[PDB]
Design a binder for this molecule. Structure first.
Ligand SMILES: *[C@@H]1O[C@H](CO)[C@@H](O[C@@H]2O[C@H](CO)[C@@H](O)[C@H](O)[C@H]2NC(C)=O)[C@H](O)[C@H]1NC(C)=O
Ligand SMILES: *[C@@H]1O[C@H](CO)[C@@H](O[C@@H]2O[C@H](CO)[C@@H](O)[C@H](O)[C@H]2NC(C)=O)[C@H](O)[C@H]1NC(C)=O
Ligand SMILES: *[C@@H]1O[C@H](CO)[C@@H](O)[C@H](O)[C@H]1NC(C)=O
Ligand SMILES: *[C@@H]1O[C@H](CO)[C@@H](O)[C@H](O)[C@H]1NC(C)=O
Lengths: 32, 111, 298, 150, 449
């Protein structure tokens, strides 16, 4: 679809968002 | 005034009694309708003069349509169907020998 | 010409007394070739607003296809390369009247398209396909009109697409009033060849109108072809250009090929088709299709 | 040579039909040209038009079907006609055989905004006139495709 | 993606039945039907599915005019009497197709000789033709005398070796023309005066040995004429039989010729008034009322070889009480109802009545005669009734759906779970604390569930 909004993302974008958002969460469960 | 289109459809390897009970013969897209006999042949009646496109319609087997030209004096000729270049002729036999190219590809494979 | 309301409760009576001058009826008399249009007054009476006449001596009306009142248009414009937008002329009260010539000679018969506005009566478009014959199957939708006919000079079935594109700047992005639209839309037409006859035709409809629009074309052999409307585009250029590549447009090819892989019914042929119904289906990617002729298929 | 078609206008507060003679369209069937000859709006007609613009009424234009035998009509909001200094556009849609099919009235600029106008801006009609036959539709272009095949 | 059958479904239909042929082996489960949609199909007897189907043109050029059955072959005449075809019922294909001469179509019938059916007889307003049976080649064709004024409407023939073409003039004389089969020469011609007679197709009928019989209610009698050994219409009254015609109604004579090569049946049916029939017998000039069926809707015939029987239909307690219809079998040679041969059924709709009735009979294992009845109602519904008790309706087929004119898709009602969402949201509680407890109680009901 070329008409669907750009806000709707595929799975790779979700994975990369999680990769970039869990870096700071790793410091809570771990010692750092 | 009006003439008839004769032909003999045939499927390679399959017997007629296995596919004639579901096929038709359409001239100019249901403008004239005919049905097949037991030996695979077919005849369409009350065809006035002009240029028509005969196609043997069957859900389980595909056939190539053939352009039939019938002059006002009864002379019938056959050729290939080409909507582009409506003047090109490729002489096909007559009575029509419309052999099938096998079952049609209704589906697309996965992946 | 007196209007009866149902349900005729007091609340509906009030909601009509407050909304009367916005309701317009149009009647098309095919035997006389008349097209009258009446305005609803406050006391449920109609006053003649507009009137056109297509003389039956030369043209007879066969189809009057208004656009569905349940469909939605997602994008009010189309990117035309260079990050530029070309806006659509989505007239919500447009009719695409189709007429056929009374002269049925193979050298003088013709088809006629009349894009009219239902409220005012201003004929937005008047076109005549010369040396063409019926029956005429027409699909009218958000912005385009796709009608099929039978070219008698070349003896072949032909599609014709009309797209109603506005300028590069929309007249009014707040509302659409057929009384205050002075600009004439830009009608782009293009004709294609079709290698088979047609028994029915419809277009897929969905709730938001996001997915691609397809044309379900019921052939006389029972098989229901699914032709992408994106293929029936008036902008497909006869010679490629850089903008055609940038917009991902295919050069103009007149042969609209029929491939068996496109039949939405593999071998469940519908003999002697008579109609195709499409429902939005709750999702945004599926359309519920019901083809009814002799056989019923869903 | 030329043929004369009547042209009548109607504007009333009760939105009724009171078509009175406005002018005549001269139509050259041998050439395809269309001209107009009218009578300017009087003081009473201008007053009625201003009152109709106040009441948001309509302005109906009508011509005979044949130069009696029938009427072909259309309408435009009188507000746009008054606020546009009587700048209107008539279009006469005909058939291939030359029969009068439709009349279309347009006001430039379209849309009402309640702009106040003096009487001196309502005593000179500014009417463009057009004749519209049906445009021949295009067919499939095969020659270019045949060359492109090479 | 070759995931068929999961989303799509197709229902095949044939139009309103016009000519049905149930006479068969009948060991084979076949039911050939020609419909009002220019469609010829072979329905299955045991399930009701379409074995094969052939769809002609939907316009008037495809209208099936007549349909006969010989053995496993079905002869069809269509296109205003212009095209004739012979379908083979087993394979579902064609045996031969021919084009008949122009002219209106009036009657079609088989002819034969020497205890064998060999030719087909076609009747047109200008000529009578005889074609072959296994090849379709025209054997001969002969003009009809006085065709400009005499409307020829009947064709009768048996093993005698001659064909009778019967024509009438409205409120005037009738005329019989007897041709020879093997030569086509007009052997005989007869004219009789008839001031009362108005029709020959739906009014008159031939009996055992070329015996033309039909009523005249103007004199309230039956006119008879033995085309073999008579030339005068003997008038027999019905006052002795206590029968009376329906005022302002067109009575009808219904004979039965099981074998198109041998003689007809002396017994026949007489439709005097709507919902009233009478089974009579003709014997050498005199009639004998075998049975009188009052308040009887429909009747049909069958032969199963030599045990020729008839079937009648009537309401149970009544215009019908609860659409409860009972079908019974009688013998033609004597109006004795066959015991243990009653089929009772009911139509689900209110203002629906049966319209057609065809009977397929067979010989039961215990030397008795069993039968299945194909009944077509007003709303184009077809029913195949068997002699059983718990399954009196073998298979039903709603053919009214072959002419869908409108279609709309409505959403199914809300689930029991989605019904609660209207409760907690939209109640418009007075304060925030009230709406809080309301939504909490809704979620509490949900967690309890
Ligand atoms: C587009 O059309 C609408 C209405 O047709 C215009 O919005 C205003 O609507 C109110 C009535 O509710 C009225 O004041 C006028 O009809 C409109 N105001 C003016 C100044 O015209 C709107 O102006 C139009 N143009 C745009 C850009 O939205
Ligand atoms: C119509 O198409 C469907 C799907 O191809 C056929 O149904 C299948 O037939 C083949 C038998 O060779 C098998 O795959 C299965 O028995 C059927 N189901 C599926 C999912 O494959 C059907 O036979 C075709 N009907 C015809 C050719 O008349
Ligand atoms: C007169 O009509 C033309 C056509 O639209 C318009 O451009 C012009 O502004 C009008 N001038 C006056 C004074 O009305
Ligand atoms: C009518 O017939 C149906 C089925 O036999 C039955 O369910 C129904 O109760 C009957 N009603 C009456 C009044 O007989």
């Amino acid at each position: 679809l070329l008409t669907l909004d750009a806000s709707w993302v595929s799975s790779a974008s979700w994975y990369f968002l999680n990769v970039f958002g869990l870096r700071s969460i790793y410091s809570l469960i771990l010692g750092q | 005034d009006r003439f008839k289109i004769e032909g003999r459809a045939v499927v390679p390897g399959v017997k007629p009694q296995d596919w004639i009970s579901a096929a038709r013969v359409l001239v100019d897209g249901e403008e004239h309708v005919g049905f097949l006999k037991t030996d695979g042949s077919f005849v369409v009646h009350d065809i006035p003069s002009g240029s028509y496109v005969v196609e043997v319609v069957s859900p389980a087997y595909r056939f190539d349509p053939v352009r039939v030209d019938i002059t006002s004096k009864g002379k019938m000729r056959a050729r290939y169907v080409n909507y582009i270049k409506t003047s090109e002729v490729v002489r096909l036999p007559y009575p029509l020998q419309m052999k099938s190219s096998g079952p049609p590809s209704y589906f697309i494979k996965r992946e | 010409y007196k209007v009866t309301a149902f349900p005729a409760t007091r609340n509906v009576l009030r909601q009509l007394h407050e909304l009367a001058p916005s309701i317009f009826f149009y009647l098309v008399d095919a035997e006389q070739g008349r097209l009258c249009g009446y305005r609803l007054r406050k006391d449920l009476t109609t006053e003649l607003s507009w009137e056109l006449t297509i003389p039956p001596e030369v043209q007879r009306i066969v189809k009057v296809k208004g656009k569905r009142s349940s469909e939605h248009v997602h994008s009010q414009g189309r990117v035309m390369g260079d990050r530029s937008v070309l806006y659509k002329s989505l007239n919500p009260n447009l009719l695409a009247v189709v007429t056929e010539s009374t002269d049925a000679h193979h050298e003088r018969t013709f088809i006629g398209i009349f894009l009219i506005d239902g409220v005012t009566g201003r004929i937005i478009h008047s076109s005549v396909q010369k040396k063409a014959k019926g029956p005429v199957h027409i699909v009218h939708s958000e912005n385009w009109v796709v009608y099929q006919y039978w070219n008698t000079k070349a003896r072949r079935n032909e599609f014709t697409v009309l797209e109603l594109y506005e300028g590069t700047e929309q007249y009014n992005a707040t509302a659409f009033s057929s009384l205050d639209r002075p600009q004439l839309p830009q009608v782009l037409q293009q004709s294609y060849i079709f290698p088979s006859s047609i028994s029915a035709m419809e277009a897929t409809i969905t709730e938001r109108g996001i997915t691609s629009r397809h044309l379900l074309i019921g052939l006389p052999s029972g098989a229901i072809l699914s032709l992408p409307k994106a293929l029936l585009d008036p902008r497909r250029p006869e010679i490629p250009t850089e903008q055609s590549r940038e917009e991902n447009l295919i050069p103009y090819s007149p042969d609209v090929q029929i491939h068996a892989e496109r039949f939405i019914n593999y071998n469940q042929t519908v003999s002697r088709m008579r109609g195709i119904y499409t429902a939005p289906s709750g999702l945004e990617s599926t359309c519920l299709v019901v083809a009814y002729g002799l056989d019923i298929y869903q | 040579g030329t043929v004369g078609l009547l042209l009548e206008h109607s504007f009333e507060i009760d939105d009724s039909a009171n078509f009175r003679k406005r002018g005549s369209l001269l139509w050259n069937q041998q050439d395809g040209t269309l001209s107009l000859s009218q009578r300017q709006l009087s003081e009473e007609e201008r007053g009625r038009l201003r009152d109709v613009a106040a009441l948001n009424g309509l302005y109906r234009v009508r011509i005979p079907r044949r130069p009696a035998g029938g009427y072909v009509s259309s309408f435009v909001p009188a507000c746009s006609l008054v606020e546009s200094h009587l700048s209107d556009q008539l279009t006469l849609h005909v058939d291939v055989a030359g029969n009068v099919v439709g009349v279309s009235v347009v006001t430039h600029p379209g849309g009402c905004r309640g702009h106040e106008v003096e009487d001196v801006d309502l005593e000179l009609f500014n009417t463009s006139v057009q004749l519209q036959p049906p445009t021949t539709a295009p067919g499939p272009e095969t020659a270019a495709f045949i060359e492109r095949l090479e | 993606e070759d995931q068929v059958g999961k989303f799509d479904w197709r229902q095949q239909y044939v139009g309103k039945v016009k000519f049905a042929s149930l006479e068969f082996s009948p060991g084979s489960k076949k039911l050939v039907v020609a419909t009002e949609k220019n469609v010829i199909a072979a329905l299955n007897s045991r399930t009701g599915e379409i074995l094969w189907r052939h769809v002609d043109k939907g316009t008037a050029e495809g209208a099936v005019d007549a349909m006969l059955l010989h053995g496993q072959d079905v002869i069809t005449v269509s296109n205003g009497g212009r095209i004739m075809r012979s379908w083979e019922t087993n394979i579902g294909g064609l045996n031969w197709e021919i084009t008949l001469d122009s002219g209106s179509f009036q009657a079609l019938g088989l002819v034969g000789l020497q205890e064998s059916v060999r030719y087909i007889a076609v009747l047109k307003k200008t000529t009578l033709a005889l074609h072959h049976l296994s090849s379709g080649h025209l054997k001969w064709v002969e003009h009809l005398p006085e065709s400009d004024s005499i409307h020829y409407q009947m064709v009768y023939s048996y093993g005698s070796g001659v064909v009778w073409a019967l024509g009438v003039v409205p409120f005037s004389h009738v005329n019989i023309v007897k041709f020879n089969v093997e030569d086509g020469e007009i052997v005989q011609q007869v004219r009789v005066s008839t001031p009362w007679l108005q029709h020959l197709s739906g009014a008159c009928g031939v009996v055992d040995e070329a015996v033309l019989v039909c009523p005249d209610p103007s004199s309230r009698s039956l006119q008879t004429l033995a085309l073999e050994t008579e030339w005068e219409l003997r008038q027999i009254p019905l006052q002795s039989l206590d029968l009376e015609f329906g005022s302002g109604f067109q009575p009808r004579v219904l004979p039965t010729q099981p074998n198109p090569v041998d003689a007809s049946r002396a017994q026949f049916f007489l439709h005097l008034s709507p919902s009233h029939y009478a089974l009579l017998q003709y014997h050498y000039g005199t009639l004998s009322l075998l049975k009188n069926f009052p308040q009887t809707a429909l009747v049909s015939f069958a032969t199963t070889g030599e045990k020729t029987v008839a079937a009648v239909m009537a309401c149970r307690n009544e215009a019908c009480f609860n659409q409860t219809y009972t079908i019974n079998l009688y013998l033609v040679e004597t109006g004795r109802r066959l015991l243990d041969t009653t089929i009772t059924f009911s139509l689900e709709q209110s203002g629906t009545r049966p319209e057609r009735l065809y009977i397929q009979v067979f010989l039961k294992k215990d030397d008795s005669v069993g039968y299945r009845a194909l009944v077509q109602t007003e709303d184009h519904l077809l029913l195949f009734l068997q002699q059983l008790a718990g399954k009196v309706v073998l298979w039903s087929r709603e053919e009214s759906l072959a002419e869908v004119v409108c279609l709309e898709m409505v959403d199914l009602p809300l689930t029991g779970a989605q019904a609660e969402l209207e409760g907690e949201f939209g109640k418009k509680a007075d304060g925030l604390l009230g709406m809080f407890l309301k939504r909490l109680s809704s979620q509490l009901i949900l967690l309890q569930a």
